[PDB]
Design a protein around this ligand. Structure first.
Ligand SMILES: Nc1ccn([C@H]2C[C@H](O)[C@@H](COP(=O)(O)OP(=O)(O)OP(=O)(O)O)O2)c(=O)n1
Ligand code: SF4
Ligand SMILES: [Ca+2]
Lengths: 124, 49, 1283
DNA sequence: AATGGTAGGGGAGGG
DNA sequence: CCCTCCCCTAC
């Protein structure tokens, strides 16, 4: 039928998922059960400026398990959201959500074990 | 508009002559214009009513 | 000059039977003729200004495909293979359409050489050259070829998305709205066509000289029988591709066939930019300005990215994989295969001549002790204080003028504590000595007989005195025509093209750009008047007008025929009108098609014959109705695209642009004033109404410079006049790319829809830093890159022809890059081990040393033009505000063109030549450059400035307490350092500085901007906030602007609170203009999923449609509406009170509470919660003729002498206001009435324009006079006066 | 029948 | 309380 524009975003998301799977298949140097499934059943969305930067943290997220989200269309289908800075309005809107510093992913990758977000929470 | 023009719900013509020039006029009043037709589409004013 | 010149205004193609001026044989198949051949009709204008119809023969569309042969052919098997493939393609195409001969679809196929443009290709590549006879089937044949319907394999097609007209113009170096040069031309049957009096009236000495020099009446004149005239122009000519002298001037370069650039063997790439530069220099020289120059600065760039090491390792691995086992190392000299016998084949531009027709001092004291010198000084105190850790300047935070608004409550928002204290003496802390406050604890002891003196100083004498004292003989433009109509509707139902006839048509050709100075008044009136009607009417109308000649016709058909004849005689190039869909040309066309059964479109066209289907895209976007040979514009749509108004109404547009107010009368009033036996005043009023409409529209088009800007854009891009505003920016990008790349024998890939859909997604996104929601009292420095993406293209060499492929997955068999798959040479990476550039996402790009990109040249030329325009704009200060506006519009257009050139990539939807990898690399390197700039800014210890907000290129730098004077130098230093650390094309400019700035969220900030230190009055700058958004109401915009200005200037929240309370009380009472409380949201009737999801304005549109089907708004047209008071729980869409229904409503009251809450509380809270206060508290804190609480006459206390005085005062004030409003309306209506006496006040009161506040004020005054309250006051007055 | 992308926010109706 | 559709703006 007509391509329109609503289905274009869905096709873009499907293509992003396929490319992430292809990149994961290409990157076979990761050890099994170590630094490869630390972010299992976890969805991470990058918001705002990050010190490691996106398209680099994206590789660490994709290779080490889990799915990467480029658009936060639905708030249910996301576990952890990464944002170095958040305004007051967005802090109010995103209450009771797990917002962590961008150093959490690199710390978990270096430690080779999933790290709790209690200490790495953006608040306080 | 520096010239006085007449209307009677049927048409508008130009009025010329020294008789009507030296007389103030306000729209909404009616007068009886008498005279002869000029060379152009204008009516000369000779006597007034 | 010595060359025939015709300005290419409009271009069209039509199929015709072959003649002896057209090629009747094909090189591939010399034994087969052509059933039909394509011909191009060009509607041109001579430099004298006369129109001319130009026929172009021998132009055949062609497309390229991969060659299935080899490079070792002996020039004999190639012809046989071409003949076989041509026969197979023709047979398959004809079978699909549903040996023999008589070729009709495919003309000829040849073998040509070329360099592919999609990817890095160096060696010569052979391509087939399939020439088609029907340009309309190009897309269908491309789709058939790409799907492998003809051949077994799915052969890739090249150069198929380019339009036939665009391809021909690029091949022949033709520019839209530009002269064409021919050495000789073949004249048609008559040397001067005379439809009515065209030959006699348009005859001039210049035409005589031109036709005597370029025609001899023996050879140039063609036979009447074989070549009859087709066009409705004064002169029609026929040319050949050999005749056109616009070619042979292009610079053809062959450097892409090998590493010529690297070996060293052998700026204005686009010729259109030179003309624009020369014109701009001539314009700036008229002001006695200086020369043009730009001093560059040396850049000390190193630039490794975040993942440079991994990409380098992967590149090394790929080079190890794709390399021959030992052997000789590749060299730039012998890498290509020499002696390949490629000279036999012909270049793409050398194949164009083939298949052509080929026609034939104070003392201290007696004993004084001196103390030690102070540790600090006048200048070092500030530096020492700053080093101590406190800001140099302590800007005052928002406060309260009086402590009564403090409320003694903690001020906080989202967990952030805010300290707000008043400057009043009540809340000021006492002065403390040694860190401990001092105060009296014991009760005061007052004595007897104590004298006191006032403390506050009185105003000075000087202040009171000061207060009292103050209180070229060459046609280079397009002819223009404007038409408007008047219809006698029945009752109040608006014009109807089915039951209502046209009674009057007014035309006014634009005399500014109309040449030939023929005998016409430039304005005319056409009115139908049957002889059976009242007599002396034509004489009355002529005497009423007495300036513009008026033509009268018995019937509407005769008037339409006369209008068509006048259009043919004048032959305008542009037909206009405010709304050419429901009125003007559209109404006449609908009437002729429906009731008169006349095809007036063909008659109005410039061709007698040879003209299909309607185009919904034209109706939706612009220029719904198409007339051959003429360009039509939806002028209201053009104004919508140009200026950001809120109503887009002719009266509103006139008031907003030309500063002229035009009364609007209902169609019932028009049909009651246009009837017979009426006064001359009414006829004069309606005639002047239509004349003012036409003249105002003409002046609007002249002031907006729409025609001139579009002509300049067409000349620069090269497309025709129509495609500038009809087609998208992708057409301009394709035209520029084709024109630039055709000089290097480049071949452009044409991927299909499936290839674009299946392309890689765009994961890389631009950086949008989240701002901190706070009120920045200290000056904020904003730094924005100028043409960041074009600078990236210029510097890092990012283009389609300089892509080796993604760094990963590289192999010598098959790689995926963009929308195509190709193969790399055996040792391409080993030879290019040094002249390569790695993109931040992992894409290898060739260095500028080995390959210079065409996109780089085009973007460099565009950026040079834009920089010169900006320099000229900055060089002129307040000398000519219209020239500055025109230059700003031109530079906006250039920036938009550069942005569209970038946006040709990443076009995953509706993209003809997209490439995900290139655009991803561009945005990723832009984000990396922004991150590096942020790191550089934050690294330096000379300024503790921290970036708080950042756009895709913009950078918001906070400067705490820098006094706003050193901030200019600090920002200049930051910009210079960032530019030095970046590449040569990349430049960073200071732009402006935000002294008072509020950051709400992403893409939403408001503050005061200081463009230059010399500026004294700051300019209000708002982005994304409700002030600039049109989804609200003017009242909320004004309130927000006033509150923001008060907060930024006085910094006293008490004044803002008082103003807000006053506004809320005024809204609740009802003393509002009722014009600033109406919404303006466009509605798309056909773009709604369901009625439930339809917008608020859709309900009003449907309600208006139900009562009358002719009130159908155009696509994306704003529909005003208001929200009246309703029952509790009622939906917002339910009420949907239209302004016409609201004003006519006897007992309709606007929802004061709904407005006050839902239009003011959210935006004011968003703009003020960053300070620590909420506007909701301020909003919530706010029987009987007089206000005795309660009480016949409804008055407890008599107080006759005061009550009657108050009633008289109120009545007198209301009557005086009404009289002033009536006088103003009468003066305004004098423009049409041309009379200040009786029968003009009635016309003035008949006005009901909704774009003028005077009408709303008059309606309110009439309602107040006719209200029940006025009756009650009169009854009370009578009762009190009854004594 | 034509359409250049990216992102972000807010308001109304239905859960 | 959160999702979806419509409107609008900034790059
Ligand atoms: N409609 C747009 C606007 C911008 N951009 C991209 C390309 C631009 O290079 C970048 C920043 O655009 P700006 O509007 O900030 O301005 P420019 O970079 O074009 O130049 P200048 O700052 O001189 O106006 O965003 C885009 O792709 N599409
Ligand atoms: S309302 Fe009075 S003022 Fe406003 S336009 Fe109509 S007439 Fe002129
Ligand atoms: Ca910019």
């Amino acid at each position: 039928t007509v391509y329109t524009r609503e289905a274009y975003f869905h096709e873009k998301a499907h293509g992003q998922t396929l490319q992430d799977q292809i990149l994961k298949d290409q990157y076979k140097d990761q050890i099994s059960s170590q630094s490869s499934k630390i972010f299992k059943n976890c969805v991470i969305y990058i918001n705002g400026y990050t010190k490691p930067g996106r398209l680099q943290l994206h590789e660490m997220i994709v290779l080490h398990g889990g799915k990467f989200l480029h658009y936060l269309s639905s708030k249910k289908t996301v576990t952890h959201i990464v944002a170095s800075n958040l305004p007051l309005k967005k802090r109010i809107e995103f209450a009771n959500y797990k917002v962590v510093s961008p150093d959490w992913i690199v710390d978990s990758v270096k430690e080779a074990r999933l790290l709790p977000w209690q200490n790495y929470s953006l608040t306080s | 508009s520096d010239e006085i023009m007449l209307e009677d719900e049927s048409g508008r013509v130009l009025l010329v002559g020294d008789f009507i020039r030296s007389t103030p006029f306000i729209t909404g009043v009616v007068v009886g214009i008498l005279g002869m037709e000029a060379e152009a589409g204008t009516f000369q004013v000779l006597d007034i009513c | 000059s010595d060359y025939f010149r015709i300005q290419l205004n409009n271009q069209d193609y039509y199929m015709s039977k072959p003649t002896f001026l057209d090629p009747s044989h094909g090189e591939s198949l010399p034994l087969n003729q052509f059933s039909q051949v394509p011909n191009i009709r060009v509607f041109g204008a001579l430099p004298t200004g006369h129109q001319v119809l130009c026929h172009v023969h021998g132009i055949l569309p062609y497309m390229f495909i991969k060659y299935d042969g080899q490079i070792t052919d002996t020039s004999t098997l190639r012809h046989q293979r071409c003949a076989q493939v041509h026969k197979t393609l023709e047979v398959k195409i004809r079978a699909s359409f549903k040996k023999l001969g008589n070729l009709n679809f495919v003309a000829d196929v040849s073998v040509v050489k070329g360099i592919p443009f999609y990817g890095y290709h160096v060696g010569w590549n052979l391509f087939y050259k399939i020439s088609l006879l029907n340009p309309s089937c190009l897309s269908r044949i491309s789709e058939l070829i790409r799907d492998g319907k003809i051949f077994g394999k799915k052969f890739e097609i090249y150069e198929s998305h380019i339009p036939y007209l665009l391809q021909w113009t690029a091949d022949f170096n033709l520019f839209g709205c530009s002269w064409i040069n021919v050495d000789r031309c073949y004249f048609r049957s008559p040397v001067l066509n005379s439809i009515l009096d065209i030959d006699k009236l348009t005859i001039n000495d210049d035409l005589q000289l031109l036709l005597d020099r370029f025609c001899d009446f023996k050879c140039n004149v063609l036979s009447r029988r074989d070549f009859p005239r087709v066009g409705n122009g004064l002169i029609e000519i026929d040319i050949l591709p050999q005749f056109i002298k616009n070619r042979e001037k292009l610079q053809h370069r062959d450097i892409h066939h090998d590493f010529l650039e690297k070996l060293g063997d052998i700026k204005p790439y686009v010729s259109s930019a030179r003309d624009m530069i020369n014109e701009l220099t001539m314009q700036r020289e008229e002001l006695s300005l200086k020369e043009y120059k730009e001093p560059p600065e040396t850049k000390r760039h190193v630039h490794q990215w975040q993942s440079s090491g991994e990409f380098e390792a992967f590149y090394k691995k790929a080079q190890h994989k794709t390399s021959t086992f030992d052997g000789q190392i590749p060299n730039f000299e012998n890498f290509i295969d020499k002696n390949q016998k490629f000279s036999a084949i012909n270049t793409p531009y050398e194949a164009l001549p083939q298949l052509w027709p080929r026609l034939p001092g104070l003392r201290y004291g007696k004993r004084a002790f001196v103390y030690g010198e102070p540790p600090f000084g006048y200048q070092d105190i500030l530096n020492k204080l700053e080093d101590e850790g406190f800001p140099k300047i302590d800007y005052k935070d928002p406060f309260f003028s009086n402590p009564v608004d403090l409320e003694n409550k903690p001020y906080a928002y989202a967990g952030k504590r805010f300290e707000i204290s008043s400057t009043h003496v009540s809340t000021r802390i006492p002065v403390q000595f040694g860190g401990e406050t001092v105060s009296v604890y014991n009760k005061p002891t007052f004595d007897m007989f104590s004298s006191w003196k006032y403390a506050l100083k009185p105003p000075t004498y000087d202040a009171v005195q000061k207060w009292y004292n103050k209180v070229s003989s060459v046609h280079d433009s397009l002819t223009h025509l404007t038409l408007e109509i008047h219809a006698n509707t029945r009752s109040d139902k608006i014009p109807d093209p089915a039951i209502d006839e046209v009674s009057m048509i007014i035309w006014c050709l634009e005399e500014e750009t109309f040449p030939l100075d023929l005998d016409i008044a430039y304005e005319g009136i056409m009115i139908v008047h049957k002889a059976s009607e009242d007599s002396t009417f034509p004489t009355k109308i002529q005497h009423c007008i007495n300036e513009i000649p008026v033509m009268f016709y018995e019937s509407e058909f005769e008037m339409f025929e006369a209008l068509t004849d006048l259009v043919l005689l004048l032959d305008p190039d542009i037909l206009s009108g405010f709304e050419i869909h429901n009125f003007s040309w559209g109404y006449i066309i609908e009437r002729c098609q429906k009731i008169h059964q006349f095809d007036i479109v063909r008659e109005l066209a410039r061709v007698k014959c040879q003209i299909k289907l309607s185009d919904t895209w034209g109706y939706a976007h612009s220029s719904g109705i198409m007339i051959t040979g003429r360009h039509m514009i939806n002028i209201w749509r053009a104004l919508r695209s140009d200026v950001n108004l809120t109503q887009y109404t002719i009266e509103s547009a006139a008031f907003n642009i030309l500063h002229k107010r035009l009364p609007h009368f209902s169609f019932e009033s028009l049909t009651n004033m246009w009837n017979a036996k009426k006064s001359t005043t009414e006829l004069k009023t309606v005639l002047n109404y239509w004349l003012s409409r036409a003249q105002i529209n003409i002046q609007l088009l002249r002031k907006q410079d729409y025609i001139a800007r579009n002509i300049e854009q067409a000349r620069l891009i090269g497309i025709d006049f129509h495609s500038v505003y009809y087609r998208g920016s992708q057409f301009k990008v394709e035209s520029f790319l084709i024109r630039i790349c055709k000089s290097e024998s480049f071949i452009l890939l044409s991927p299909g829809k499936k290839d674009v859909r299946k392309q890689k997604a765009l994961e890389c996104v631009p950086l949008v830093m989240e701002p901190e929601s706070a009120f920045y009292k200290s000056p904020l420095i904003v730094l924005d890159f100028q043409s960041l993406y074009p600078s990236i293209m210029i510097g890092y060499n990012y283009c389609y022809s300089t892509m080796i492929g993604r760094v990963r997955e590289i192999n010598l068999t098959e790689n995926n890059l963009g929308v195509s798959k190709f193969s790399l040479p055996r040792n391409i990476l080993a030879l290019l081990k040094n002249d390569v550039t790695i993109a931040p996402n992992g894409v290898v790009y060739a260095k500028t040393s080995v390959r210079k990109s065409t996109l780089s040249k085009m973007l460099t030329d565009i950026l040079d033009v834009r920089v010169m325009i900006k320099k000229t704009m900055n060089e002129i200060g307040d000398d000519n505000t219209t020239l500055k506006r025109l230059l700003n519009n031109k530079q906006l257009a250039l920036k938009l063109l550069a942005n569209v050139t970038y946006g040709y990539t990443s076009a995953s939807f509706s993209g003809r030549m997209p490439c995900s990898d290139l655009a991803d690399s561009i945005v990723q390197t832009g984000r990396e450059t922004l991150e590096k700039a942020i790191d550089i800014i934050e690294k330096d210890e000379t300024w503790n400035a921290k970036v708080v907000y950042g756009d895709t290129d913009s950078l918001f730098v906070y400067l705490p307490g820098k006094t706003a004077i050193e901030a200019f130098s600090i920002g200049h230093a930051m910009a210079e350092r960032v530019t030095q650390n970046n590449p040569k094309p990349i430049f960073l400019k200071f732009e402006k500085v935000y002294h008072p700035s509020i950051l709400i969220s992403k893409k939403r900030y408001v503050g005061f901007s200081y463009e230059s230190p010399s500026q004294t009055l700051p300019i209000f700058d708002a982005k994304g906030i409700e002030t600039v958004r049109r989804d609200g109401i003017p009242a909320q915009q004004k309130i927000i602007e006033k509150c923001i200005r008060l907060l930024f200037q006085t910094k006293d929240l008490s004044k803002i609170k008082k103003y807000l309370q006053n506004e809320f009380f005024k809204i609740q009472i009802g003393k509002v203009s009722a014009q600033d409380f109406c919404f303006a949201k466009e509605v798309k009737l056909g773009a709604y999923k369901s009625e439930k999801t339809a917008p608020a304005g859709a309900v009003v549109v449907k309600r208006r449609i139900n009562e009358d089907h002719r009130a159908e708004p155009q696509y994306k047209e704003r529909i005003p509406y208001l929200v009246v008071k309703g029952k509790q729980g009622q939906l917002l869409r339910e009420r949907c009170v239209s302004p016409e229904e609201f004003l006519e409503g006897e007992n309709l009251e606007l929802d004061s509470e709904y407005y006050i809450n839902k239009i003011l509380i959210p935006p004011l809270d968003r703009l003020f919660n960053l300070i620590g206060i909420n506007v909701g508290n301020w909003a919530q804190e706010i029987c009987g003729e007089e206000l005795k609480i309660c009480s016949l006459c409804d008055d407890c206390l008599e107080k006759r002498s005061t009550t009657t005085l108050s009633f008289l005062i109120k009545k007198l004030k209301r009557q005086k206001e009404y009289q002033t409003l009536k006088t103003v309306c009468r003066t305004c209506s004098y423009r049409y009435t041309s009379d200040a006496g009786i029968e003009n006040d009635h016309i003035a009161s008949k006005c009901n324009s909704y774009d003028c506040p005077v009408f709303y004020s008059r309606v309110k005054a009439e309602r107040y006079l006719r209200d029940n309250q006025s009756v009650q006051r009169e009854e009370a007055l009578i009762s009190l006066n009854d004594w």
